[PDB]
Amino acid sequence: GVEIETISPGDGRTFPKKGQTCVVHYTGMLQNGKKFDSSRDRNKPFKFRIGKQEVIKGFEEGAAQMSLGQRAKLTCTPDVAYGATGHPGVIPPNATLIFDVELLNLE
Amino acid sequence: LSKKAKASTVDLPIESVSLSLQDLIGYFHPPDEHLEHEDKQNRLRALKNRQNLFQEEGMINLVLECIDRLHVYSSAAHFADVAGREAGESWKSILNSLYELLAALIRGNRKNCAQFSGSLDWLISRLERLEASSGILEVLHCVLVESPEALNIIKEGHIKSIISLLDKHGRNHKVLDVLCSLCVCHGVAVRSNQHLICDNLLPGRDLLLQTRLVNHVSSMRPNIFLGVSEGSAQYKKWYYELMVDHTEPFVTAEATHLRVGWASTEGYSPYPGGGEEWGGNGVGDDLFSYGFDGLHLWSGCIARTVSSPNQHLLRTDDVISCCLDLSAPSISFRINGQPVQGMFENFNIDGLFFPVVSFSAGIKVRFLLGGRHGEFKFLPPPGYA
Amino acid sequence: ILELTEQEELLKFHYHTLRLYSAVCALGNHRVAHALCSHVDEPQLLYAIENKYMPGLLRAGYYDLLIDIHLSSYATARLMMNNEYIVPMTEETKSITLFPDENKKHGLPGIGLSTSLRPRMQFSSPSFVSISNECYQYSPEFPLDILKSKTIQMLTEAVKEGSLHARDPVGGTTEFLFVPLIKLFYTLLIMGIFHNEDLKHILQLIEPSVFKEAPKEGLLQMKLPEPVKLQMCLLLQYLCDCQVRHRIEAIVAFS
Amino acid sequence: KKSSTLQQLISETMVRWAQESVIEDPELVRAMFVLLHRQYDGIGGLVRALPKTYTINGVSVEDTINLLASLGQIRSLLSVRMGKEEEKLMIRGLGDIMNNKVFYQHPNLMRALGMHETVMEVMVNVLGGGESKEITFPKMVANCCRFLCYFCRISRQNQKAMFDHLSYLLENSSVGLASPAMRGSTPLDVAAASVMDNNELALALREPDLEKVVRYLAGCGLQSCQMLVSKGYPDIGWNPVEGERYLDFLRFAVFCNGESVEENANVVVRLLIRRPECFGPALRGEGGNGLLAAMEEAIKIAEDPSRDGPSPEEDDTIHMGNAIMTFYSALIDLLGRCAPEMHLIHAGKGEAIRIRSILRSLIPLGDLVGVISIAFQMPTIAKDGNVVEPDMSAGFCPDHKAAMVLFLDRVYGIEVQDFLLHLLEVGFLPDLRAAASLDTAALS
Amino acid sequence: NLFLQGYEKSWIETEEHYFEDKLIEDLAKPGAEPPEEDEGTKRVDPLHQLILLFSRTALTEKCKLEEDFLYMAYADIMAKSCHDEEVKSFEEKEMEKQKLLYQQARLHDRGAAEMVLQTISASKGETGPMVAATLKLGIAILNGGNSTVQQKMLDYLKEKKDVGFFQSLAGLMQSCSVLDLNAFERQNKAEGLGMVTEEGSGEKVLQDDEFTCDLFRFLQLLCEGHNSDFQNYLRTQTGNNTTVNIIISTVDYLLRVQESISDFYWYYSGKDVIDEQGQRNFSKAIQVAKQVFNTLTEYIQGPCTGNQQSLAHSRLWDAVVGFLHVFAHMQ
């Protein structure tokens, strides 16, 4: 349920492995074009370990499919992103989220 | 009248009721601000005593009964049909005056606003109707600011009705003020109402005005103005190239903007058409320009993903070649010598066309317009001047 | 947004929208503050902070929204226990003295080694991709150093601008120029972000001659409006409270 | 030269502004003159600051930090209205505070931080919310009352600080007395803990407060329990469950450290005889069957399911018979404790003589002898051998007779050997024989 | 910790500095008024603004008079400024009287009398530190029988038609305390037990002797100097819709304090020696009774025939026949 449109190419050899923290700069957006989150806005890279169930799953598969240094557009369907309940106060119910994700570094 | 008795036989003190309501509004008029302190305090004391006596005699319920009996009739025309012409014209004014009197009776007095607690639920039930929206909203504001028990009474459905008032009646800052009063009362905040107001108003992003921090975008164009017309000596095919010497993907928090392509002018005036001079708009953000960002064909501020071998956002050392056939309206692109699989076709040819590029910051590009000015990295398509 | 200076209806509606944003996050609703960080983010806040052409009402609303969303809960926390003095009796506490040196001259208020127990700084980063709920504890993080530098730079410029009695203060009136900026400065001082040389510079701004370390007049003699005078009184009261706390610490050290 | 001091600078600028312009904003004038007064009364600054100054060693710093954070959370709950999640927040905060060792080691710091009045204010706000409508969030109220009682028991100075707020507590005495499993967690319990086992505090206790309590007891004796009849309990005229609580408070008020506070006992007896409705229907004096008849009828009621239970261990099923028995037992215990001391009665003080005479008139000897003569049901092993123990709180309790004995020995005086042997044979010997029979292993 | 508390209560409290005169003198100075841009009437001086704020706070309608730290601070400051407290000759006597007149002028020229009447009226007859400080300030500005201040207060009361002032005076009179022999016996048994109460002073007997003496010194100074018009006003408030007989209320309090003194005597009838606490209670109660008697004497002097008849028909004679017995036996 996650698609990858490559804005910028990556090395193509290095990918997120199990138990490895992936740092990314993401710019979350709704389909209508509005923005709800941006690690670039806070000027702090977002730091998460893949496969440890800490981020929305669709973002997780998108990052896993990404490669080092690659910049890609992650379209996350409502099932893989916040579901029918939606994130209260930010994400409306049954919302599809598109992210501009860049894999800054892999560790 | 409700028992369908004859209107002439029934007596309705229409004029005297309005005159007395004006008298009561004057009698409960709040003291004027510029008055001296002592006189102001005396008049507040008198108003407080008046409200106390009226509430003890139970005038609030009488006013509520009159308001209910007037709301029995849906519209001014309906009241004019069930009653006399004079009642028809006075229905709106009397109903507004009653709400003004209710607000005057409850305003500033804590005990009256506390006794209004039972009637909060009934009052909000008529918030949607236009003839009483302003008066009901004012009464609600007074009760909320004065009585904490009103905040206890207000429920999720009442908050949703107040919010839907914004959706149906448009933007009104008084509804926002009422919602603010709901959140905090006398230095005490209610977590339930805060959460409900947030979770119901904010996520939609359709009622409150939205904000974003957007980069400025500027457009550079050559002096040429090429167009197509019958019996006019212009070569319908044209070709030019642009190379990105340097580009920064993120100079600011927002992504950099770099689009290349053709643009047209409404009429024969040299001003580019359909776009504002300054702002965040660039090539393709109107139906007068046509752009290529490296991944999307931009026209009318709508982007479509166009395929291309090793498609990427326009980066350093990228040579973009633009094509224009005015014989059959068609704009084609070709990045690094290989063609992208997208075309702008059957667009308007009334006006003149010219090359244009849009950039925001950190952009370093060079026009290659052919001949002495620029030397084409790639060979122009056959017959393209 | 700067085009609203001439459209009164949208200006008023957006000012009330900003005040509603403040109200929903008022009194430490950390969850609602995290939610609001999406609608109004850090770059938007800072640009509203610094822009000189902003309408007065929007400027006043934005300086309050920033305070309420990011730095209000800790400000109230440290302000609530400002009258209690639990002083650990350790060596750095024993080192405290009433006067900085042998000469009996008062040191600059605030600057010094204070050992009294004090609430703990803690902020949670708002990330909506995260599914964790522990971030709803504490309030959203903000660049407290960039904010500090910007606040002092803006106040330094504002002192020079006001002395000139310029036709156009930022926001249209001297009140809109000063009172919200002074409010943000006071909030930062209450949080105690300012320290050492930075606090020395801001004290020199407040009054050069008196706080000159051991010309251009300060705010206390620059013919301020009454709304600004109240915030000046608040700042001076905080300075007096800092001196009282220093006295209490020195008494505990002597004991 | 320049002022060179913050004090002089403030004193100059405040006066300069005030004489420069007519300040119209009242808050500005107030702030300016408050600041000027602080400058001119700097020693007063230390006068206010020092009481709220405490010192701790290095080892307790972390625990003090955690307790200060918990107190900050509890104080922050004041600014918001009470709610379901606020209940969780308060309860976890108070649990943390009670677990902190500094809470025990430094009671003076705990008092100086004034958390005691903070919890009290939270109580006031929540009690005011839904005043007549029982108590919303009853568990949170129970937790606050438990914390306050424990704070009273920590130290005597804390107990004095608690007793300082007795008037409000008695104003809100009737909050959750009727509901069981709320017992030990009501404001009346906090009042009892504040005036518990402290002779100085018992002497300081005033007469109007006792009058308020006695009026509450009269209301309980006259009017039924509406919350219980709402649950479907049979409607009798008086309120035994709440009356027992109100009598227990008076017991703690009049009996301190083994002796009996004479000043409080005399006032309590006088009020209780000015309004005889508090004694209950058995001893109102008109149509009164008597204490022994009341006990027998209560045994019958407790054995019957229809009266003892509502039928549309106590919070689920308040036993009407046990409630009546414990009410009368508490009343008798209160009277016996209010009886004057034997040293004074032998010294011949007329007031002590008179109070003894009044109590003797109030309660006849034969009724007490009969109540003592009432026997106890013996739990029995079944044919399986498993012991069939009826709920002890359902029926006639040994403490019920313990109160009887206390009254008997403190008002009459066991001085006749014939009466001694009579009481022995009728009530004392059979119970001790029953204990002898129960001395078997399982029955032990 | 023990050292901190002892140091506080032994040194910091006992430290005394006399700044009130300097503060009031500075606050009364109009500073560079012509250089200041008035272009008309002079700006009210800072003391005038402070008094105006304190007056408006009282004039604002509230259900209760909220205790204000600013008011208890500045009221004591102004009272000390007014007072500024071997045999002095006539020159010294006259200089002191002239000094006190000017010191009282610095306040009553700026509405201090109106402020002290308004605070008492807004008290609604509730005893508190607010009204204790207000009464002390009133005594300060009326000390010596300041005819100008008496005239200002009487004129203000007449033109405002104020009934709350006299209602609050009455209510304060009923709220005033007397000897409580029951409390004395309870505290004595506590002392016999030996456990010193956390409140070591133990002045529950005669709760507020200073407040009672101040309340009655105020009323005596109000009629001081044979102010016959003000005495008649106190007896019957002519213009006001409802009147309160302050003369009768005063003698009612005198009767209550007489009964308290008589009971305390009768409790010490048997004991051979009066204990120190008994002597202190007698010392305070006798002073209170003396102040009430002097207040009544100032009521009835200046042959105020109305007051004379009102007290002649009052319960005064019972208090008189009681004090006669007390004096007959205590002598």
Numbering used by the authors:
A (entry chain E): 2 to 108
B (entry chain A): 436 to 820
C (entry chain A): 1641 to 1854, 1889 to 1929
D (entry chain A): 2053 to 2364, 2377 to 2508
E (entry chain A): 3618 to 3702, 3710 to 3955
What does the published report state?
Ryanodine receptor type 2 (RyR2), an intracellular Ca2+ release channel located on the sarcoplasmic reticulum (SR) of cardiomyocytes, is essential for cardiac muscle excitation-contraction coupling. Structurally, RyR2 is a 2.3 MDa homotetramer consisting of two functional regions: a massive cytoplasmic region, also known as the cytoplasmic shell, which comprises several regulatory domains (NTDs, NSol, SPRYs, RYs, JSol, and BSol domains) and the stabilizing subunit calstabin-2, and an activation core and pore region, which comprises the Ca2+ binding site and the transmembrane domains. Dysregulation of Ca2+ handling, characterized by aberrant SR Ca2+ leak, is a pivotal pathophysiological mechanism in a spectrum of cardiac disorders, including heart failure (HF), atrial fibrillation, catecholaminergic polymorphic ventricular tachycardia (CPVT), and other arrhythmogenic disorders. Here, we solved the cryogenic electron microscopy structures of ryanodine receptor 2 variants linked either to heart failure or inherited sudden cardiac death.
To induce reversible oxidative modifications, S-nitrosylation, and glutathionylation we added H2O2, NOC-12, and glutathione, respectively, to the purified RyR2 protein. However, the reaction time was limited to 30 minutes to avoid aggregation and denaturation of RyR2. Treatment with H2O2, NOC-12, and glutathione also rendered the cytoplasmic shell in a subprimed state, slightly more downward-outward than the control (RMSD = 0.13). As with RyR2-S2808D, we were unable to detect any additional cryo-EM density to attribute to post-translational modifications due to the limits of the resolution obtained from the cryo-EM experiments. This was because of the reduced number of resolvable cryo-EM particles (1.4 particles/micrograph for the H/N/G condition vs an average of 12 particles/micrograph for the other conditions) likely due to RyR2 aggregation induced by the oxidizing agents. However, we hypothesize that in vivo the membrane-embedded channels would be more resistant to aggregation and denaturation and a more pronounced primed state could be achieved thus increasing the diastolic SR Ca2+ leak.
